[PDB]
Amino acid sequence: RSLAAIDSMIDPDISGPMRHIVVKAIHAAGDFAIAPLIRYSDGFFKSMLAKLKEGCTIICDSEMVRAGIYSRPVLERNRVVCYLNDVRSKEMADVNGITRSAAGIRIAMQDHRNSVIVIGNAPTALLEAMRMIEENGWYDIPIVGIPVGFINASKAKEGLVSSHIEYISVEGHRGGSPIAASIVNGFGRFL
Amino acid sequence: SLAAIDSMIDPDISGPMRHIVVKAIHAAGDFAIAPLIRYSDGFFKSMLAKLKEGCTIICDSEMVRAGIYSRPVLERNRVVCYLNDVRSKEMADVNGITRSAAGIRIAMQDHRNSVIVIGNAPTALLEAMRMIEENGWYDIPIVGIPVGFINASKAKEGLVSSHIEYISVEGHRGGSPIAASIVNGFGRFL
Amino acid sequence: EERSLAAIDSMIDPDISGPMRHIVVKAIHAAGDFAIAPLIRYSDGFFKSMLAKLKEGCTIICDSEMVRAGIYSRPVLERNRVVCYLNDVRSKEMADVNGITRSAAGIRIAMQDHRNSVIVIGNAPTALLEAMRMIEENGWYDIPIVGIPVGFINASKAKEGLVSSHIEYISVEGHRGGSPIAASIVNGFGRFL
Amino acid sequence: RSLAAIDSMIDPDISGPMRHIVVKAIHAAGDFAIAPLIRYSDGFFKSMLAKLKEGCTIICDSEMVRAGIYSRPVLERNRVVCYLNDVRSKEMADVNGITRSAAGIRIAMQDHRNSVIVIGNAPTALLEAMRMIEENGWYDIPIVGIPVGFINASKAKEGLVSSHIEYISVEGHRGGSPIAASIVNGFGRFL
């Protein structure tokens, strides 16, 4: 079938598990184009797998991302959260002059230290996660950074692919909740 | 940005729909779907009637449901998703159809007066069309944006050729963000 | 040419049967992008109309040298002559007077010199527009059009008219197009000559 | 107006004449998706401009690429060639065990050392050009490496972006003669 074909048009170097994660991402996006455009750090799979295996809090930048993670094996030992509507989020958003998305990420990360960050929408939420991780030295936290937007989104993801943070992202303008959520769901098969 | 999007849209697309189209394009973060967006002449009217008078907005996935937040829309309409209803798994297994398709069928059986929003499953779009055509419920419009490949293309191709009021995106592209943005876009006209 | 062929075949709707499935597979392969598979469109009479023209020997009119250079099918060239009048020095003069682009002027002139033709557009929307105008005004509906212009708003609008006309054709909905695609479509018929 | 649209997709850091070139390439491809995917070395513009201005040999991998280069300023001082049909091509392809395109590139380069390489189709052509350069140390030769394909294309261009060769390319599967030719024509305005 379709998906059975994608699986052979993917970088032969992408080995095992990740190939599965890439296929899921391609399907969620309904666009093979992103196959050669997916980028990730050498330790992303391990970092991610560890967290999801042990059980952690999965911090999402939007409700659509949160709602998109349904893999039973994942939800078994992990909790998915979104702090967009948190009282403290809007308060800090207005005060500090940062987007509500970015503020949600900050409050969420302070509430749950053992986390995984999934960005499927706002570039500002990605930048905030990176900030938090770097300034706190929380490099155990991997990032699924798939924000949407054009130049703003690209600039944000360019920094990701340069930091000391474990991650997975997509080169270009493609991004979104379906892709972000599918990457997380893809891990269910290895839990 | 928003200046570039509106220029990518054929000047002939005028009226409220031009607003809907820019939201779809913006949510998709890709100018490529601009000339691929399609809708029936009666779609705007059919949709506004339902959303104005208040109906049930049936979604194939929770992502689509979570993406609809327009206050004017939510105040008059109820947004539901039966994907995870316990009755859906049972029906899907008994009939050998997908869970998404089962959820659409259960939802439409429970709520006759509806609007169908498909942001993910091609089989969900196919089931919505089957229900409408088998029952003659042409009062129901469909936002058919399933994502996928051959399966998705073909289902949306069927949609465009049907006598059902709809909006869709030709090809493989689609998704919850786009589907949800279109519904949100109507809030302005309610 | 690889597992690619198989991959491409899975991307093409089963509904596409007969010789056209081969031609479509070649178009997608030339575009090196599965995305256009669902975007390809063509009239029911396109294949028969094209094969007739190429089997009997005609003049393949192109809107650019790239398209012309891309057509190499021996079977095709053995019977048909490929041309391109973007440079005929009657083009610029005509472009100025009539207020059209040189690509369009090149088409009009080429068609006047050769009526028994096949039209291949891989670049200029105005070339596609001009070919359609020539056909609808003189009622030369025996001429098929491979209308694959490239561009954004202008290209899409031009191709939507094609898919809505009485003309036999093959096109790609949206922004995508190009000489590689247009030329591969013609090369595809070679296998049936 | 499509110009402004395009220009709005180009990352602001892309300044200078190269911005004009990037605009031309996107327009030729009728796809804004490649805007953030165009890559080029720091010395590419200067190198390309100097060669085309001085008058060199533009070695193309396909006839469609050669036919696509029509800029008068370029043609007035540069010879555009394609050795795909040269007799030595097949004879060398056989003994060396490489494709025809690759062979054409190799023969073309042996005939003309002062060149500019323009690849608009065959991945093996790009690979061969890079090989010739790295082996002989001809790093003065710039490459417009825009092969098309699914698997091999993306990978071949990947090595290009990471070599020491001055170049311009497009990440991913997107490529082709129209884009490669537009880039070359784009330089005419500066000669």
What's the CA gap between A11 and A186, in Å, rounded?
18
Is D164 among the residues known to form the active site? no
Are D184 and D58 spatial neighbours (Cβ–Cβ below 8 Å)? yes
Are C32 and D175 spatial neighbours (Cβ–Cβ below 8 Å)? yes
How many angstroms away from the CA of A150 is the closest CA of chain B?
Answer: 7
CA C77 vs CA C19, C82, C105, D65, D156: distances in Å: 19, 8, 25, 20, 33
Catalytic residue among A20, A27, A112, A173: A27
Nearest by CB to D36, from A11, A32, A172: name it: A172
Stated in angstroms to one decimal place, the resolution of this structure is: 2.1
DSSP A28-69: HHT-GGGTTTEEE-TTHHHHHHHHHHH--EEEESSHHHHHH-
CA C53 vs CA C56, C69, C138: distances in Å: 5, 20, 18
Approach to solving:
X-ray
How many residues are given for chain D? 191
Amino acid, res. B121:
A
Domains in chain B with CATH codes: 1-190 (3.40.50.10230)
What are chain C's partners, defined as 3 or more CB pairs within 8 angstroms? A, B, D
Three-class DSSP category at B81: strand
Three-class DSSP category at B96: coil
* Six-digit token string for B94: 């008994």
Neighbouring C-alpha atoms within 13 Å toward the C-beta of A75:
11
Contacting residues of D for C181, CB less than 8 Å apart: none
* Six-digit token string for C158: 């031009």
Nearest by CB to C10, from A5, A31, A33: name it: A5
DSSP chain A: -HHHHHTTSS-TTS-THHHHHHHHHHHHHT-GGGTTTEEE-TTHHHHHHHHHHH--EEEESSHHHHHH---HHHHHH-EEEE-TT-HHHHHHHHHHT--HHHHHHHHHHHH-SSEEEEESS-HHHHHHHHHHHHHHT-TT--EEE----SHHHHHHHHHHTTSS--EEEESSS---HHHHHHHHHHGGGG-
Three-class DSSP category at C167: coil
Residues 6+ away with beta carbon under 8 Å from C174: B32, B35, B36, B170, B171, C36, C39, C156, C159
Active-site positions of B read 26
Three-class DSSP category at B97: coil
Residues 6+ away with beta carbon under 8 Å from A48: A116, A142, A144, A166, A168, A187
**Could you tell me which chain D residue has the CA closest to the CA of A38?**
D172
- Asked if B36's CB is within 8 angstroms of C153's CB, the reply is no
How many angstroms away from the CA of B1 is the closest CA of chain D?
Answer: 7
